[PDB]
Structures are given as structure tokens and as C-alpha cells.
Amino acid sequence: MATPTNAVSTVEINGKREDLIDIIYNIAPYDTPFMTAIGKGVATAITHEWQTD
Amino acid sequence: ELRQPGKNTRVEGEDATIKAGSFTTMLNNFCQISDETLQVTGTADKVKKAGRK
């Protein structure tokens, strides 16, 4: 009972390899609602100018 | 160079006493290192400028 007397089990062997998931789980928030909502554009100078009417 | 001319009168059969010769002159100069350095920030190359790309 409770494993035969002289059976070879995982307790006795020594060459067992490790098991790694190979995936890293990161759930920290990095969403940018305002940046995603607004538009994109290109500026060609230190000062950016526009007009209203 | 050559020596300056002068009086040259000798007694007959003077059993010449051997006059000293002339030797060259050594001149030398040292080397010199000149350099110029320049540093430009990254922003100064992206903005538009008149007359330069």
C-alpha cells in the first residue's frame, strides 16, 4: 500500500527537467483614453500655430 | 656654408700643420596638432530652416 515496496517513482529519480510557462502575465493598466480619442498631427517647428473664426 | 676669405701667405716647405675643416649645421622642428569640434542638438536638425537642410 502507498506505492509498492521497491517501485521506481518520481521521488527517487534525479534527472527531472523543470517546467516553465514561457509566458509573462502583466495586467498593469497602460491605456490612454484621452490620447486615443483625440486626433494625430505633425508639427514642423518649436511653436505650433492655428486660427479660429 | 663656406668660410670667409683672408690672407694666405706661406713659407717655402712649411711642413704643413693641417688646418681644421668645416662641418654642417643641424636644424629641426617639432610637429603640431590642430583640431576643430562641433556639437549639435537633435532638435536643431528636425525643425525647418531657411537656406539649410
Closest Cα in chain B, distance from residue A40 (Å): 18
Quick check: A45 and B47 CB within 8 A?
A: yes
A48: closest chain B residue by CA: B47
A18 touches B19 (CB < 8 A): no
In this structure, the number of other CB atoms found within 10 A of the CB of residue B26 comes to 5
* DSSP string for chain B: --PPP------TT----------------------------SHHHHS--SS--
B46-50, long-range: CB within 8 Å, 24+ apart, which pairs?
A: B47/A44, B47/A45, B47/A46, B48/A44, B48/A45
Number of residues that this document lists for chain B? 53
A43: closest chain B residue by CA: B47
Quick check: A46 and B47 CB within 8 A?
A: yes
Could you tell me the three cell numbers for B5? 676669405
Q: How was this structure determined?
A: cryo-EM
